[PDB]
């Protein structure tokens, strides 16, 4: 054989060289660094009003406004500072799995099992919120979506692919393929020039938004990936999985850097988020709690067990003042 | 201490709370039924017979049912079955006419599954005009050697029904309601109505501890 032999020998030799040139793990270089202690955080605000499971939640860029979607087919925009409901958007499909808040603050994006990314305009002259656009073309369910700008958004899908759209035209500018399983989460880089996405094929990968080419792929995993997020500098990313482990990868070494697992943890991770410093990795599990992990020591730096149901979504403000956590118990909680 | 504007903000929040509560109530009087099964298992036939994700809202005897057909999701990754908790029932459609082994493994999957531990399932063999003619070709041993009964419709059909029921290893909590009557008769919905009524009554009793 030549094509099979070529593929096998390539993969083997690249991976062997990567392993050989690997110097040390994340923990090996930070052993001298002192820990953070116990991250004891209190529920400062509790957002009541959602009457079903909360699936997605995204902070606004002002670090004061929130948007959350519930299984009840409702997208609530909250004023976290006073828990003062700013907007209530009735979604067209009640099966919504992702939320995004536009960096400018004029738009919010949502969607789910309807295979459509709906974009709603907040700053209208009529005093209400309306459906600005609907992006269609994905075949599998809508896993995640993130605004690049006021007119350019990126989406992941069960279509085993991703899509870069142009909101004005409504057509998908680029289609990113290469995954073999359902793509469950995408994170946008701070400079909005790349992104990373994990799929049900138990693999993650870095995709370039401009060239539409598959820049890199990362493996070393047992189960599917349900959550992914960038380090605040866009030089790494953490993934969460049904494996009951969270893994931190670097996009330059091309190798997994650190593992975030504990023996007593038996269920998967639903959501992943980073501290403003990238010093605390917050992970929502199916154990009805949220764990704070020392991103450099891999130890559990605390817990947020104020919810009596799985912590479906996490989120950290842009200023790092508070953490929003949404669970299936129909409550969002802000912690500080 | 509130300013002239914060008091109006609080008023707006309270009005939104009222609207959210009054719409959640409207959403809680609705019976959610998942529709599952293999292709050409009558899923298309049932949705028409019934009075991306395709939602069919129909009212029967004052009960408003949202039947969700998710056969459109071409990724068989069950990464959304957890979204269907709380559904009153799963309507599983299978066709007598080794596809049967495929259906059996699917039924075992949906029943055994933990998101659906207690969710009673409404098994269906809707059609009955082509389920008998093809039993004269050969008995239920084309791919099922174990059967040793009469190669007639009632005997074989009853055997298949029982073998699929046997895949329930958790009757303690959930129940299976099986249907055979021909799809042509419009009783597919009535049987669904009875089964959901039974499931709801038992959910209520199992909630006050009486059960």
């Amino acid at each position: 054989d030549q094509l099979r032999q070529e593929a096998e020998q390539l993969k083997n030799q690249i991976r062997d060289a990567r392993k050989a040139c690997a110097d040390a793990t994340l923990s090996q270089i930070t052993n001298n660094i002192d820990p953070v202690g116990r991250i004891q955080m209190r529920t400062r605000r509790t957002l009541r009003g959602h009457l079903a499971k909360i699936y997605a939640m995204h902070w606004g860029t002002d670090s004061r406004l929130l948007v959350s979607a519930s299984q009840d087919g409702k997208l609530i925009i909250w004023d976290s500072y006073t828990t003062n409901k700013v907007h209530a958007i009735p979604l067209r499909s009640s099966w919504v799995m992702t939320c995004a808040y536009a960096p400018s603050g004029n738009y919010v994006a949502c969607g789910g099992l309807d295979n459509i990314c709906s974009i709603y305009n907040l700053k209208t002259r009529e005093g209400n919120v309306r459906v600005s656009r609907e992006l269609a073309g994905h075949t599998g369910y809508l896993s995640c979506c993130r605004f690049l700008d006021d007119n350019q958004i990126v989406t992941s899908s069960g279509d085993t692919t991703c899509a870069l759209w142009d909101i004005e035209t409504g057509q998908q500018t680029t289609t990113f393929t290469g995954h073999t399983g359902d793509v469950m989460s995408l994170s946008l880089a701070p400079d909005t020039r790349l992104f990373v996405s994990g799929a049900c094929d138990a693999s993650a990968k870095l995709w370039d938004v401009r060239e539409g080419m598959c820049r890199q792929t990362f493996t070393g995993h047992e189960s599917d990936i349900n959550a992914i997020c960038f380090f605040p500098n866009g030089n790494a990313f953490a993934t969460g999985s049904d494996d009951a482990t969270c893994r931190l990868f670097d996009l330059r070494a091309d190798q997994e850097l650190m593992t975030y697992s504990h023996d007593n943890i038996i269920c998967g991770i639903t959501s992943v988020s980073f501290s403003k410093s990238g010093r605390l990795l917050l992970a929502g599990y199916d154990d009805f709690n949220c764990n704070v992990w020392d991103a450099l020591k891999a130890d559990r730096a605390g817990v947020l067990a104020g919810h009596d149901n799985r912590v479906s979504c996490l989120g950290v403000t842009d200023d790092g003042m508070a953490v929003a956590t949404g669970s299936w118990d129909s409550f969002l909680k802000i912690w500080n | 201490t509130l300013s002239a504007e914060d008091k109006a903000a609080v008023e707006r929040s309270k009005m939104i709370d009222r609207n959210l509560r009054e719409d959640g109530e409207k959403a809680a009087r609705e019976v959610k039924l998942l529709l599952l099964g293999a292709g050409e298992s009558g899923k298309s036939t049932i949705v028409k017979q019934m009075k991306g994700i395709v939602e069919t809202h129909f009212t029967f005897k004052d009960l408003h049912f949202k039947m969700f057909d998710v056969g459109g999701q071409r990724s068989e990754r069950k990464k959304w079955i957890h979204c269907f908790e709380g559904v009153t029932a799963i309507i599983f459609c299978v066709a007598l006419s080794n596809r049967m082994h495929e259906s059996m493994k699917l039924f075992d999957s949906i029943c055994n599954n933990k998101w659906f531990t207690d969710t009673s399932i409404i098994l269906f063999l809707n059609k009955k005009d082509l389920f008998e003619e093809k039993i004269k070709k050969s008995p239920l041993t084309i791919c099922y050697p174990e059967y040793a009964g009469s190669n007639t419709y009632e005997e074989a059909a009853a055997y298949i029904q029982c073998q699929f029921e046997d895949l329930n290893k958790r009757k303690d909590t959930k129940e299976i309601y099986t249907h055979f009557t021909c799809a042509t008769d419009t009783k597919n919905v009535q049987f669904v109505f009875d089964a959901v009524t039974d499931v709801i009554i038992k959910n209520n009793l199992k909630d006050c501890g009486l059960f």
Epitope: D79, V86, G127 | -
Partner: single-chain antibody, 232 residues
Framework: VQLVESGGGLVQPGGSRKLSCSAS????????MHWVRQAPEKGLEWVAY????????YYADTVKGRFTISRDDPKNTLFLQMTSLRSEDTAMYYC??????????????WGQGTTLTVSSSDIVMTQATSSVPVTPGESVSISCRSS???????????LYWFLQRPGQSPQLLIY???NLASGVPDRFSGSGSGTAFTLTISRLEAEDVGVYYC?????????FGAGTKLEL
């Protein structure tokens, strides 16, 4: 967005009437509608306020116990029923929309007004002048003073800035402090501290002539200024 008033006319003292604000082109139902008035070449004067949901109704001391404000959300129509009308109730009355949430502009749109003629504690804000000659291209600086500190504990200095052009209803320039409204040219700017407040205009144009008004929203009743005129 469109707010059209009606019901004006000439009324003898001791009569009663009902000004109507037949709004159009926006969600009037979720909007807190205010009633303002301007007496003949004397200035703007707040009349009343009704919040979204009719949960809060405020009246000016002049119309406190006399006149009422009614909402009709399903019909998108504000109302002001005036019972006893003295000779001081002669003025052109404006219907204004106002929405209150974090970051909102609470006086974005004013109506065109309707005229009413009649036969024959509160924060005080003063406008230093009433007429200022200027030519196009020369920057202008209007200013006004207030009694208390409009700066609340929120950090919001609830001072507003409207401009009324000749022969047309007032238009909102600023809504807290330099926070330019939607559709206003970027040249207009605001600033101030506590009591002294200023509005700066760079590269003045022919459409910038009129009367500048500074109002406060920290406490009710809402009090406007006299009105600083710009000449050319």
């Amino acid at each position: 967005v469109q707010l059209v008033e009606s019901g004006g006319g000439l009324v003898q003292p001791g009569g009663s009437r009902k000004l109507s604000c037949s709004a159009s082109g926006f969600a009037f139902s979720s909007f807190g509608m205010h009633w303002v008035r301007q007496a003949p070449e004397k200035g703007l004067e707040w009349v009343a306020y009704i919040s979204s949901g009719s949960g809060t109704i405020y009246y000016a001391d002049t119309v406190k116990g006399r006149f009422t404000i009614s909402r009709d959300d399903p019909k998108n129509t504000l109302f002001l029923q005036m019972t006893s009308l003295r000779s001081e109730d002669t003025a052109m009355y404006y219907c204004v929309r106002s929405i209150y949430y974090y970051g909102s502009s609470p006086f974005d749109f004013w109506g065109q007004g309707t005229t009413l003629t009649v036969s024959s504690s509160d924060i005080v804000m003063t406008q230093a002048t009433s007429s200022v000659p200027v030519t196009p291209g020369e920057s202008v600086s209007i200013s006004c003073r207030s009694s208390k500190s409009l700066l609340h504990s929120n950090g919001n200095t609830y001072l507003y800035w409207f401009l009324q052009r000749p022969g047309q209803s007032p238009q909102l320039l600023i809504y807290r402090m330099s926070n330019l409204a939607s559709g206003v040219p970027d040249r207009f700017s605001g600033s101030g501290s506590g009591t002294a407040f200023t509005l700066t205009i760079s590269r003045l144009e022919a459409e910038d002539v009129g009367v500048y008004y500074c109002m406060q929203h920290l406490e009710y009743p809402l009090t406007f200024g006299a009105g600083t005129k710009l000449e050319l």
